[PDB]
Amino acid sequence: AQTVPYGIPLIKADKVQAQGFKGANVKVAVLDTGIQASHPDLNVVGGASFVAGEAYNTDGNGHGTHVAGTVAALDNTTGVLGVAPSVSLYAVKVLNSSGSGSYSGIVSGIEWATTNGMDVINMSLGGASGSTAMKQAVDNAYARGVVVVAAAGNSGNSGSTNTIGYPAKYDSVIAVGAVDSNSNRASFSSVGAELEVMAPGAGVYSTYPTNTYATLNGTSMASPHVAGAAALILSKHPNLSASQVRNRLSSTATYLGSSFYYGKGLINVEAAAQ
Ligand SMILES: [Ca+2]
Ligand SMILES: [Cl-]
Ligand SMILES: [Cl-]
Ligand SMILES: [Cl-]
Ligand SMILES: [Cl-]
Ligand SMILES: [Cl-]
Ligand SMILES: [Cl-]
Ligand SMILES: [Cl-]
Ligand SMILES: [Cl-]
Ligand SMILES: [Cs+]
Ligand SMILES: [Cs+]
Ligand SMILES: [Cs+]
Ligand SMILES: [Cs+]
Ligand SMILES: [Cs+]
Ligand SMILES: [Cs+]
Ligand SMILES: [Cs+]
Ligand SMILES: [Cs+]
Ligand SMILES: [Cs+]
Ligand SMILES: [Cs+]
Ligand SMILES: [Cs+]
Ligand code: NA
């Protein structure tokens, strides 16, 4: 039978889904280690691989399959339930089976998704530095109407130090930090001026290869909650621009404490989508 991971009602995605908004016909690209497209609780409609030797529709790491199910695990009588279980899901493989990738592969994936009409790009990846082409790619995606979401980073706090990674740190990109099921900041979650919102990231249960389900911790688990939440808002107001979706998630978040640690707080998609 179907488990509803705690993140889904914590962000109030269950309430939006119950009004009948589930992300139908919103295109979401998951830039990651690929997706196990044969998993019975996922429906991958397309994708691309910028990684040598691996197709887009297999996942030898498990990371991208897990991130994909938090966005879009099918609503049925098995496995788990995604935040937006009716989205059109695309696997854009920019990370190899060891979980890492090059800047030009990532840039390629961003461009691919912008060129192919994605509505939402999720990047559950980050690096300490970032590059020129990456900045342009995310800026061009956002100016073309794509909501761009990324994991803030799992560097924790460092006294006064901004520890947010790239691409989260670009202001075209929503930087997403992690809370647990008690809505407290997870310790590994990065902090800093660019931190925008928090979502579930500790103890997140989702699809995993092969055909199973697994619990992972990270701002990578938090990010897809916000990607799926973006898809829910668009399924309810299809004419909103990317700025408007982003400002709704931000400005309706539940305040949890200092924005250095929590951004504007915990997303609430019921309030955002209303
Ligand atoms: Ca399911
Ligand atoms: Cl299926
Ligand atoms: Cl590794
Ligand atoms: Cl610390
Ligand atoms: Cl910045
Ligand atoms: Cl708190
Ligand atoms: Cl508009
Ligand atoms: Cl707020
Ligand atoms: Cl306060
Ligand atoms: Cs499938
Ligand atoms: Cs592996
Ligand atoms: Cs289950
Ligand atoms: Cs924009
Ligand atoms: Cs730390
Ligand atoms: Cs709890
Ligand atoms: Cs608490
Ligand atoms: Cs902040
Ligand atoms: Cs739109
Ligand atoms: Cs609020
Ligand atoms: Cs406040
Ligand atoms: Na940002």
XYZ file of N, CA and C in Angstrom, residues 18-145:
384
model
N -5.946 17.425 -2.873
C -7.316 17.089 -2.542
C -8.288 18.086 -3.207
N -7.806 19.257 -3.625
C -8.673 20.172 -4.361
C -8.603 19.816 -5.833
N -7.807 18.787 -6.171
C -7.654 18.346 -7.546
C -6.524 18.974 -8.366
N -5.594 19.716 -7.742
C -4.402 20.210 -8.461
C -3.166 19.351 -8.188
N -2.645 18.698 -9.223
C -1.652 17.678 -8.986
C -0.489 17.859 -9.927
N -0.413 18.988 -10.594
C 0.704 19.252 -11.548
C 0.520 18.762 -12.985
N -0.723 18.438 -13.375
C -1.008 17.854 -14.710
C -0.425 18.719 -15.808
N 0.319 18.114 -16.719
C 0.864 18.857 -17.837
C 1.832 19.970 -17.441
N 2.412 19.936 -16.244
C 3.556 20.816 -15.994
C 4.838 20.019 -16.281
N 5.764 20.558 -17.055
C 6.972 19.787 -17.350
C 8.081 20.116 -16.347
N 8.536 19.101 -15.619
C 9.590 19.261 -14.637
C 10.798 18.451 -15.045
N 11.945 19.113 -15.172
C 13.208 18.422 -15.428
C 14.012 18.218 -14.143
N 14.440 16.987 -13.921
C 15.263 16.653 -12.764
C 16.678 16.485 -13.294
N 17.540 17.464 -13.007
C 18.942 17.399 -13.417
C 19.692 16.661 -12.319
N 20.166 15.452 -12.581
C 20.644 14.582 -11.499
C 21.367 13.345 -12.094
N 21.366 12.233 -11.362
C 22.047 11.003 -11.781
C 21.166 10.184 -12.750
N 20.154 10.818 -13.337
C 19.205 10.065 -14.139
C 18.064 9.592 -13.254
N 17.222 8.720 -13.804
C 16.022 8.205 -13.102
C 15.819 6.766 -13.558
N 15.549 5.847 -12.629
C 15.190 4.472 -12.995
C 13.783 4.501 -13.588
N 13.726 4.728 -14.888
C 12.465 4.898 -15.583
C 11.586 3.614 -15.546
N 12.166 2.438 -15.357
C 11.317 1.256 -15.151
C 10.664 1.134 -13.765
N 10.914 2.053 -12.840
C 10.379 1.876 -11.480
C 8.852 1.962 -11.590
N 8.108 1.042 -10.942
C 6.639 1.083 -11.137
C 5.971 2.270 -10.463
N 6.660 3.032 -9.615
C 5.976 4.201 -9.024
C 6.354 5.573 -9.678
N 7.043 5.528 -10.838
C 7.461 6.737 -11.605
C 7.051 6.674 -13.087
N 6.718 7.808 -13.666
C 6.466 7.823 -15.082
C 7.357 8.895 -15.734
N 8.440 8.468 -16.367
C 9.373 9.387 -16.996
C 8.984 9.537 -18.462
N 8.642 10.728 -18.933
C 8.230 10.855 -20.325
C 9.340 11.232 -21.320
N 10.513 11.662 -20.841
C 11.568 12.050 -21.759
C 12.831 12.418 -20.986
N 13.842 12.927 -21.688
C 15.060 13.285 -21.040
C 16.257 13.239 -21.961
N 17.425 13.382 -21.360
C 18.651 13.483 -22.124
C 19.785 13.208 -21.175
N 20.885 12.736 -21.739
C 22.039 12.476 -20.915
C 23.232 13.219 -21.435
N 23.859 13.998 -20.552
C 25.110 14.668 -20.875
C 26.283 14.029 -20.245
N 26.111 12.766 -19.892
C 27.088 12.004 -19.201
C 27.470 10.833 -20.101
N 28.782 10.673 -20.343
C 29.310 9.631 -21.237
C 29.022 8.236 -20.716
N 28.458 7.362 -21.561
C 28.366 5.929 -21.219
C 27.062 5.513 -20.537
N 26.196 6.474 -20.189
C 24.958 6.146 -19.445
C 23.708 6.772 -20.129
N 22.673 5.993 -20.385
C 21.482 6.586 -21.001
C 20.776 7.515 -20.011
N 19.682 8.304 -20.255
C 19.080 9.231 -19.278
C 18.132 8.508 -18.377
N 17.741 7.315 -18.818
C 16.625 6.623 -18.186
C 17.025 5.450 -17.344
N 18.298 5.416 -16.987
C 18.765 4.519 -15.938
C 19.447 5.377 -14.843
N 19.571 4.831 -13.631
C 20.183 5.557 -12.514
C 20.998 4.557 -11.731
N 22.310 4.610 -11.887
C 23.186 3.709 -11.151
C 23.570 4.257 -9.781
N 23.150 5.473 -9.446
C 23.432 6.023 -8.121
C 22.200 5.890 -7.185
N 21.022 6.295 -7.649
C 19.825 6.240 -6.826
C 19.415 7.641 -6.425
N 20.365 8.549 -6.453
C 20.071 9.917 -6.068
C 18.920 10.497 -6.932
N 19.042 10.466 -8.263
C 18.037 11.109 -9.122
C 16.670 10.456 -9.087
N 16.663 9.149 -8.882
C 15.400 8.397 -8.778
C 14.689 8.845 -7.499
N 15.453 9.030 -6.432
C 14.868 9.449 -5.161
C 14.289 10.887 -5.274
N 15.107 11.820 -5.771
C 14.649 13.167 -6.073
C 13.417 13.177 -7.015
N 13.417 12.343 -8.061
C 12.268 12.281 -8.949
C 10.996 11.837 -8.248
N 11.071 10.947 -7.258
C 9.840 10.433 -6.643
C 9.285 11.458 -5.657
N 10.146 12.305 -5.094
C 9.657 13.349 -4.191
C 8.846 14.372 -5.013
N 9.290 14.668 -6.234
C 8.491 15.493 -7.117
C 7.198 14.808 -7.567
N 7.288 13.533 -7.992
C 6.315 12.927 -8.952
C 5.983 11.425 -8.785
N 6.331 10.816 -7.661
C 5.873 9.454 -7.409
C 4.344 9.385 -7.626
N 3.924 8.416 -8.419
C 2.537 8.289 -8.846
C 1.596 8.044 -7.676
N 0.405 8.595 -7.831
C -0.651 8.451 -6.826
C -1.459 7.180 -7.133
N -1.282 6.107 -6.363
C -1.847 4.801 -6.740
C -1.919 4.004 -5.446
N -1.850 2.687 -5.502
C -1.999 1.963 -4.274
C -0.693 1.294 -3.918
N 0.437 1.900 -4.320
C 1.721 1.346 -3.923
C 2.765 2.414 -3.709
N 3.866 2.040 -3.076
C 5.047 2.858 -2.976
C 4.826 4.140 -2.218
N 5.132 5.279 -2.844
C 5.027 6.590 -2.168
C 4.149 7.527 -2.991
N 4.093 8.794 -2.626
C 3.229 9.754 -3.281
C 4.133 10.963 -3.456
N 4.239 11.512 -4.676
C 5.022 12.734 -4.886
C 4.257 14.002 -4.474
N 4.942 15.119 -4.416
C 4.268 16.417 -4.189
C 3.313 16.781 -5.344
N 3.719 16.493 -6.588
C 2.878 16.737 -7.770
C 2.853 15.489 -8.620
N 2.007 14.514 -8.248
C 2.118 13.208 -8.910
C 1.606 13.159 -10.350
N 1.011 14.236 -10.878
C 0.614 14.238 -12.316
C 1.569 14.999 -13.266
N 2.737 15.462 -12.792
C 3.638 16.179 -13.705
C 4.191 15.266 -14.791
N 4.557 15.891 -15.915
C 5.411 15.264 -16.942
C 6.847 15.406 -16.477
N 7.450 14.261 -16.142
C 8.763 14.179 -15.565
C 9.829 13.902 -16.630
N 10.890 14.711 -16.656
C 12.020 14.485 -17.583
C 13.265 14.216 -16.779
N 14.000 13.179 -17.182
C 15.272 12.871 -16.576
C 16.403 13.490 -17.428
N 17.140 14.422 -16.848
C 18.268 15.009 -17.528
C 19.506 14.630 -16.753
N 20.252 13.657 -17.256
C 21.358 13.140 -16.519
C 22.572 14.038 -16.713
N 23.026 14.672 -15.627
C 24.141 15.580 -15.660
C 25.184 15.089 -14.642
N 24.814 14.075 -13.835
C 25.707 13.446 -12.837
C 25.911 11.957 -13.184
N 27.102 11.447 -12.920
C 27.429 10.059 -13.236
C 27.020 9.199 -12.062
N 27.259 7.891 -12.148
C 26.753 6.975 -11.139
C 27.446 7.122 -9.784
N 28.615 7.773 -9.764
C 29.257 8.136 -8.483
C 28.674 9.428 -7.924
N 27.733 10.066 -8.610
C 27.106 11.231 -8.003
C 27.831 12.529 -8.317
N 28.697 12.556 -9.322
C 29.207 13.870 -9.686
C 29.293 14.166 -11.196
N 29.472 15.430 -11.543
C 29.476 15.825 -12.953
C 30.301 17.068 -13.269
N 30.405 17.430 -14.534
C 31.231 18.565 -14.913
C 30.328 19.762 -15.084
N 30.918 20.942 -15.029
C 30.192 22.167 -15.300
C 29.577 22.233 -16.691
N 30.277 21.771 -17.711
C 29.660 21.849 -19.048
C 28.479 20.861 -19.270
N 28.526 19.683 -18.650
C 27.367 18.780 -18.654
C 26.129 19.401 -17.981
N 26.335 20.013 -16.826
C 25.252 20.694 -16.121
C 24.702 21.828 -16.954
N 25.590 22.716 -17.430
C 25.188 23.790 -18.334
C 24.414 23.201 -19.514
N 24.981 22.190 -20.199
C 24.194 21.489 -21.236
C 22.793 21.090 -20.807
N 22.663 20.563 -19.596
C 21.341 20.058 -19.174
C 20.447 21.240 -18.966
N 20.989 22.341 -18.464
C 20.121 23.485 -18.202
C 19.632 23.992 -19.545
N 20.555 24.147 -20.476
C 20.165 24.598 -21.814
C 19.153 23.683 -22.457
N 19.366 22.366 -22.338
C 18.436 21.406 -22.912
C 17.029 21.633 -22.377
N 16.911 21.822 -21.078
C 15.592 21.970 -20.487
C 14.984 23.301 -20.915
N 15.786 24.357 -21.013
C 15.243 25.646 -21.449
C 14.805 25.497 -22.912
N 15.614 24.841 -23.725
C 15.260 24.718 -25.135
C 14.033 23.844 -25.333
N 13.860 22.843 -24.486
C 12.771 21.908 -24.704
C 11.482 22.214 -23.935
N 11.313 23.451 -23.480
C 10.035 23.892 -22.870
C 9.791 23.419 -21.419
N 10.835 23.087 -20.667
C 10.572 22.753 -19.277
C 9.890 23.939 -18.567
N 9.021 23.659 -17.603
C 8.420 24.704 -16.788
C 9.211 24.879 -15.460
N 9.885 23.813 -15.017
C 10.575 23.768 -13.696
C 11.834 22.951 -13.850
N 12.934 23.448 -13.315
C 14.196 22.738 -13.357
C 14.581 22.545 -11.901
N 14.857 21.291 -11.500
C 15.365 21.012 -10.174
C 16.802 20.578 -10.246
N 17.664 21.227 -9.449
C 19.038 20.841 -9.349
C 19.473 20.464 -7.912
N 19.426 19.174 -7.652
C 19.810 18.617 -6.372
C 21.290 18.333 -6.427
N 22.040 19.381 -6.699
C 23.477 19.303 -6.806
C 23.971 20.682 -6.422
N 25.259 20.814 -6.200
C 25.820 22.132 -5.902
C 27.322 21.999 -5.855
N 28.037 23.080 -6.116
C 29.490 23.070 -5.973
C 29.923 24.297 -5.202
N 31.132 24.265 -4.682
C 31.609 25.394 -3.889
C 31.869 26.630 -4.742
N 32.076 26.475 -6.041
C 32.383 27.665 -6.803
C 31.490 28.118 -7.947
N 30.902 27.263 -8.756
C 30.177 27.913 -9.883
C 31.063 28.468 -11.043
N 30.444 28.866 -12.168
C 31.185 29.307 -13.355
C 30.348 30.325 -14.127
N 30.966 30.955 -15.139
C 30.359 31.980 -16.027
C 29.231 31.450 -16.890
N 29.476 30.312 -17.544
C 28.452 29.699 -18.388
C 27.237 29.223 -17.564
N 27.491 28.723 -16.359
C 26.417 28.282 -15.481
C 25.524 29.433 -15.075
N 26.147 30.557 -14.721
C 25.412 31.786 -14.357
C 24.507 32.185 -15.522
N 25.065 32.284 -16.733
C 24.257 32.610 -17.930
C 23.101 31.630 -18.170
N 23.401 30.336 -18.042
C 22.412 29.314 -18.291
C 21.214 29.496 -17.345
N 21.449 29.653 -16.039
C 20.335 29.758 -15.060
C 19.575 31.064 -15.250
N 20.309 32.140 -15.590
C 19.712 33.469 -15.832
C 18.818 33.445 -17.091
N 19.316 32.845 -18.170
C 18.540 32.673 -19.371
C 17.275 31.777 -19.175
N 17.413 30.692 -18.406
C 16.280 29.819 -18.041
C 15.221 30.605 -17.299
N 15.613 31.273 -16.209
C 14.658 32.095 -15.431
C 14.014 33.241 -16.289
N 14.802 33.977 -17.072
C 14.221 35.023 -17.958
C 13.308 34.446 -19.022
N 13.547 33.206 -19.438
C 12.604 32.546 -20.353
C 11.380 31.939 -19.685
N 11.209 32.101 -18.380
C 9.983 31.610 -17.769
C 10.113 30.278 -17.013
